[PDB]
Amino acid sequence: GIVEQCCTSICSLYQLENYCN
Amino acid sequence: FVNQHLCGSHLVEALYLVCGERGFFYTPK
Ligand SMILES: [Cl-]
Ligand SMILES: [Zn+2]
């Protein structure tokens, strides 16, 4: 999930947008 | 923009910045 995606490895602001409503 | 490690409350702050008025869901596994 978002935690594996952004915390454990790295992620972009664009990937974070996937979690906007 | 850049990639980075975002953990804990920092991840949620980033979601707030990116999504803003759209709202978002934070659902850890
Ligand atoms: Cl910290
Ligand atoms: Zn901190």
- With tokens 């979601």, the residue in question is B15
Angstrom CA distances, A7 to A15, B5, B9, B12, stand at 12, 5, 11, 11
Of the candidates B14, B27, B29, the beta carbon closest to that of A16 is on B14
d(Cα B7, Cα B17) in Å, to the nearest integer?
15
Dihedral of alpha carbons B22, B27, B28, B29, sign: negative
**CA torsion B22→A4→A11→A16, rounded to 10°?**
-10
Determine which helix (DSSP H) or strand (DSSP E) holds B16, and give its type and residue range.
Answer: helix B9-19
d(Cα A14, Cα B10) in Å, to the nearest integer?
16
Q: Do B19 and A7 touch (CB under 8 A)?
A: no
Q: Which residue of A has its CA nearest to B22?
A: A21
Listed residue (B21, B27, B3) closest to B12, CA to CA: B27
| Structural tokens at position B2 | 């850049």
- With tokens 């934070």, the residue in question is B26
According to the entry, how was the structure determined? X-ray
Query: In degrees, to the nearest 5, what angle opens at C-alpha B18 toward C-alphas B28 and A2?
Result: 20
Q: Spell out the domain ranges in chain B.
A: 1-29
